[PDB]
Amino acid sequence: EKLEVSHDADSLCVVIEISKHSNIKYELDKESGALMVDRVLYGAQNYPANYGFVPNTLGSDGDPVDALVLSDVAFQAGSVVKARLVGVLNMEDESGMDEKLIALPIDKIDPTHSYVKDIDDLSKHTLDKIKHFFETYKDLEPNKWVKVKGFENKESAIKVLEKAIKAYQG
Amino acid sequence: EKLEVSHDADSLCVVIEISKHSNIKYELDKESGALMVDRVLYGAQNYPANYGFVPNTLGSDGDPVDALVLSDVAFQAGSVVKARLVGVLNMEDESGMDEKLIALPIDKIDPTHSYVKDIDDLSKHTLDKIKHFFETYKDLEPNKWVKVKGFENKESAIKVLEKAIKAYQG
Amino acid sequence: EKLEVSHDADSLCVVIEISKHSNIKYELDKESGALMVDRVLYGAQNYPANYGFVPNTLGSDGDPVDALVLSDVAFQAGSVVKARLVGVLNMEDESGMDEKLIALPIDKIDPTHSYVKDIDDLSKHTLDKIKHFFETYKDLEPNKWVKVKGFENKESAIKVLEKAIKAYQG
Amino acid sequence: EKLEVSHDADSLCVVIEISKHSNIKYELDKESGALMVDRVLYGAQNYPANYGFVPNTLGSDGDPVDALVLSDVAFQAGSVVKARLVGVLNMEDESGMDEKLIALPIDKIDPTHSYVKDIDDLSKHTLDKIKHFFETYKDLEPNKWVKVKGFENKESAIKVLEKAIKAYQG
Amino acid sequence: EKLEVSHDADSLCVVIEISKHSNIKYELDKESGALMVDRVLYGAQNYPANYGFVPNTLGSDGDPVDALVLSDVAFQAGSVVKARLVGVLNMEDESGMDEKLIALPIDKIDPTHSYVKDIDDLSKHTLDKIKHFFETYKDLEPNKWVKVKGFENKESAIKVLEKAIKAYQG
Amino acid sequence: EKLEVSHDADSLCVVIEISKHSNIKYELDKESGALMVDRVLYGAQNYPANYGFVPNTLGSDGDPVDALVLSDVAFQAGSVVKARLVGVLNMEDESGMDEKLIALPIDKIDPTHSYVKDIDDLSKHTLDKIKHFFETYKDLEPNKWVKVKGFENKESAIKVLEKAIKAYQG
């Protein structure tokens, strides 16, 4: 399946593994292309946005860099969406430092938030909800935890992405 | 509207103001009978059960004692359901000590959890989810907070209810 | 609340107590106007249509004559809808002979099935689903049962309605 | 039921008759307090926001002034929400000139769009969707039509509201 | 993935890319088999039916002939459904003449509309909704438009299909 | 796609073809990996749990042994979930004797029912609903029927699974 990849920070594709408002976390097994049921959120929570990963990249944890795709609608898990970066969320968990790219679907797809140029263009409310979600969505999971540092603009996200792309190429 | 009340701990009625899986907290204005939109949860959360109150009772905060109605389905806000007590959840918030009765719809209505005789019959998972919800659903709300103490069996809940009924009668 | 009633067989109003696709059966307490949670279907079923009753009428069981409002959408329980009769479903349960009027919302409201003039205009599939639902939705409920006889055209339904209206007037 | 009214442009209450994403248009019969099913949208559409009316006011068409309550969530029809004005949408239909207030729930309820101070703060996308909805949601309804003029800021909306309040008082 | 194709006008398979009531338009990348997020409807609309394409065919626009699968339920995007033709919808857009086959799932799958033998058997309401959807679902999309001509019976649809099958074979 | 299989009775994987509460029965075509729409339930019913099959096994009917995955949430059709056995449901249909494994997702995925060690740990209500579903979900389907025998503990299910695994290996 996965063989297409576009890596432009303003036209990079994200593979949705989790849909917005969903409490079921899926994970794609690149070899089988099979959508795996990784887990069901322990608490009365649900993802604040569409969750996925950028293919052909290597993040800090050995897996392709993760990315959250913000929008009013929830994309189907297993679907792919061309998006653009606007920032990045830095946090720390039991495994180590974790980086999560903040993206929005490209305008030719969905222009509801075309006005969002950088991380600071997203409303305060949304950022707090997302940050609070990650800071607590693993509270009830034994020997698991998260400590959110904060967000960083688009320029910072591009570097995370580019570094993740090179790591996969060598 | 509200004029019917049954107060038996095994056949008391609860007025649903919030449906399960909903992130919108409603509140009934007894005088108008109008379903009021109290607030939309700040975080990416949703109620772990149906939320309502027992009419003709007076809780610690001056309002009718609150009660959570557990079940697999979500009841419509504004609807009334005959339930039975199985326990009570004790917590503390910015306003003071808060008590929330834990109930289940009576069997002639829905017998999915008829096997649940006491608080300890509910699975550990469910109790942790409910407790975690209340312990965090007000994190992002300025000058608001909650500090959950724990659960107490049915015998303890009956006393809370009976005390709440007498307080309203005098 | 309830004080408005229109009784024309082609413009009679139905008070929705159950929405289509819902497994939760509500019942309106005319005195309180409170939407009561009567029960949650024991089996893996859901109503094949919107369920309600015609106000100011007296059916065979002492309660206002029941009526099913067919349409593609599900109406909110507690809402009222002006409909027109097209037939009636005759069945027998533990309480006795039961009659359920088959109606459709008036065209100025929803004209999706304006072509349905009589019971025989509804597709075979829909009629079997509705009949099968009632014939089994009470299988798991102790000491409760249903034995569906069949459907009868519009002319037959009008007589059921008119008889139900007179019974309430005297 | 309806007896409470707050009329401050920044704390006025709206009675929701239609929930966001719903294709079923409800209408409240003030006398009965009964939620009436006015109609089901003829086309493959759904309201771009929560639709309701401000009580104790008299709009251009003889009924209480209408108002759209924008938010990410859909409020239950029949519920009441304290909101604040940010603008107004002017249009023309078969009945005459129609005015629809554009509002947002007050922050103590839902602060997702607290940053929206005036009509021009809402994204272009949202305004076009709302305008396009009204400009076409009545295309298939015989002898019915709409011709949207445009939006007007908050200062303009306040005057519409205040004029609607006085009209009801005399 | 795609290697199975049945081409009988009464047993041809359609690959669902869009589910009924959905506002998210997906598109399958035959090479990757990856479900692509093509776009989110600009207006407050949603598809009047399941949308997909017939594999191993070549339509007027160079892509496999499109087909709408009508039914009461919404099929999951990426799923395949054996259907039968009943007509075809002719329209014109910025790209040129567009043809969209009107189909229904075969009876051994879903017999709700088995009575529909030809395009004229579908209710007027449904046809107008579908036609109105296409005539306006691209209004807000810059440099894009649609001008619906009308529907044509089953005999006409078979010719469109057969012509689309031959075009792919040579 | 399908090439991964784990066969431990406490860590065996199930390929979800039907999600809980869904009335649409999907079936995976192992060769194409295409999710096929097998049928839409004739009656007003919906699956009491997630339905799927264990890959690399051969059941009594020539197809991989079937298994129901119980949980509070509905898994997406086409997704895979690691589960554990707790029992088996024996029934008879027009094709012959049918066996359906009763499983629960492994705890590292979803521990809501970790307390369920054997078939007898599941509530009576749930078992009756599941049994009643299968005993009637094919009533309206011509020349099709089911006659449920009953449930059998985990030890019995393991033998069914192991026998199904060997049958596929030779």
PDB file of C-alpha atoms in Angstrom, chain C residues 6-13 83-85 161 165:
ATOM      1  CA  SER C   6     -55.732  18.234  15.657  1.00  0.00           C
ATOM      2  CA  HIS C   7     -57.654  15.021  14.893  1.00  0.00           C
ATOM      3  CA  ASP C   8     -57.955  14.874  11.104  1.00  0.00           C
ATOM      4  CA  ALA C   9     -56.786  11.475   9.766  1.00  0.00           C
ATOM      5  CA  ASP C  10     -54.688  13.440   7.258  1.00  0.00           C
ATOM      6  CA  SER C  11     -53.449  16.066   9.689  1.00  0.00           C
ATOM      7  CA  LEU C  12     -53.470  14.391  13.134  1.00  0.00           C
ATOM      8  CA  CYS C  13     -50.575  15.067  15.494  1.00  0.00           C
ATOM      9  CA  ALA C  83     -48.895  13.185  10.322  1.00  0.00           C
ATOM     10  CA  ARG C  84     -51.352  11.314   8.113  1.00  0.00           C
ATOM     11  CA  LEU C  85     -52.643   7.737   8.391  1.00  0.00           C
ATOM     12  CA  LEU C 161     -58.704   6.470  15.278  1.00  0.00           C
ATOM     13  CA  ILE C 165     -61.401   9.774  19.766  1.00  0.00           C
TER      14      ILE C 165
END
